[PDB]
Design a protein around this ligand. Structure first.
Ligand SMILES: C[C@H]1NC(=O)c2cc(-c3cccc4c(=O)n(C)c(NC(C)(C)C)nc34)[nH]c21
Length: 273
C-alpha cells in the first residue's frame, strides 16, 4: 500500500516531530514528504468523522486542507503496527525559514512584511477551520522559493481551537507566552499572537529575543539590529505581558507597518530568485 505507491528518498530531518523523508508518488511523480511518527510518542489522540482513532495531527490537517496553499496539505496517511505515516505535499525547490534566516541573517523589512503577512493569513485560515497550531516558529515554515509562498507545517503539537483555557502545552518553550511560563495557563489566540511577535522579531533581528524563562516573564524587548519604529511597535504590542493587551489578528494586519505588502511572486522576484 505505502511501498508500491511511493518511492522513498533521503531523510529530510528528524526530532520531536518524528522522521521525515523526501519522496515521490510513483503514479504521477508528484514530489511528497513522508512523515513517520511512533505510536508511543503520540500523547494527543483524536477521532475522524468515520470514528477511527488517529493522531490529533491527522484530524487537524484534514480540517485545514483546501485549495489554500498557506498550510501544508495532507495527501494521505497510513497506520502501521507501531507507527503512523503521513504523506505531505512537498514544494520544490524549498527552504525552511530557520535555514533561510541563518544564511541571510536579519531580513530586510520588505521581505519580513511579505513573509509575516503570509504567516498571518495561514494562521487565520487554521483558526477559521477550528485549528490551533501551538508551535508557530521559523522551523515550522517552508518557503516555496520559486513562487515566494510560505507554508505552515507540523501540527503535532496542535489542538482543536476553543475559547476556554489551555492547561497543556507541547510546543517550543522559547516561543511560549509568559502566562504559560508562570501559571501553566493560556488562551489560544493570544498565545498565538505572542509566538507571532517572537517570529517577527526573529525575522527582523536574525534571532529570537528571549532565551530564559525570566526573560520571557520580564518581556523587555531589546533590538540588536536596526529596526524601524513601526515594526518595533508591532513587535512590542504582540509581546504584551498581559494577554488581553495583545493585538487581534485584525489589528496586526491593519497595523501601519503591515501596509502595502508585496504579492508572493513579487517577493520571489525581488528577494529570492
Ligand atoms: C518539522 C517537521 N514536522 C512536520 O510535521 C513536517 C513536515 C515537513 C515537510 C513537509 C514537506 C516538505 C518538507 C521539506 O521539503 N523539508 C526540507 C523539510 N525539512 C525539515 C523541516 C524536516 C528540516 N520538511 C518538510 N517537515 C516537518
Amino acid at each position: 500500500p505505502l511501498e508500491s505507491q511511493y518511492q522513498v528518498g533521503p531523510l529530510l530531518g528528524s526530532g520531536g516531530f518524528g522522521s521525515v523523508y523526501s519522496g515521490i508518488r510513483v503514479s504521477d511523480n508528484l514530489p511528497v514528504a513522508i512523515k513517520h511518527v511512533e505510536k508511543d510518542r503520540i500523547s494527543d489522540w483524536g477521532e475522524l468523522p468515520n470514528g477511527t482513532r488517529v493522531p490529533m495531527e491527522v484530524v487537524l490537517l484534514k480540517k485545514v486542507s483546501s485549495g489554500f496553499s498557506g498550510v501544508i496539505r495532507l495527501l494521505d496517511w497510513f497506520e502501521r503496527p507501531d507507527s503512523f505515516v503521513l504523506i505531505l505535499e512537498r514544494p520544490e525547490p524549498v527552504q525552511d525559514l530557520f535555514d533561510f534566516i541563518t544564511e541571510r541573517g536579519a531580513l530586510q523589512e520588505e521581505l519580513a512584511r511579505s513573509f509575516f503577512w503570509q504567516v498571518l493569513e495561514a494562521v487565520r485560515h487554521c483558526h477559521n477551520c477550528g485549528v490551533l497550531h501551538r508551535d508557530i516558529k521559523d522551523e515550522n515554515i517552508l518557503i516555496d522559493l520559486n513562487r515566494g509562498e510560505l507554508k505552515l507545517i507540523d501540527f503535532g503539537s496542535g489542538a482543536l481551537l476553543k475559547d476556554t483555557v489551555y492547561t497543556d502545552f507541547d510546543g517550543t518553550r522559547v516561543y511560549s507566552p509568559p502566562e504559560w511560563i508562570r501559571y501553566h495557563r493560556y488562551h489560544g489566540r493570544s498565545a498565538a499572537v505572542w509566538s507571532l511577535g517572537i517570529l517577527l522579531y526573529d525575522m527582523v533581528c536574525g534571532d529570537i529575543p528571549f532565551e530564559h524563562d525570566e526573560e520571557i516573564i520580564r518581556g523587555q524587548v531589546f533590538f540588536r539590529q536596526r529596526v524601524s519604529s513601526e515594526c518595533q511597535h508591532l513587535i512590542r504590542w504582540c509581546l504584551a505581558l498581559r494577554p488581553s493587551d495583545r493585538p487581534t489578528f485584525e489589528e496586526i494586519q491593519n497595523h501601519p507597518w503591515m501596509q502595502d505588502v508585496l504579492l508572493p511572486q513579487e517577493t520571489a522576484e525581488i528577494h529570492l530568485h
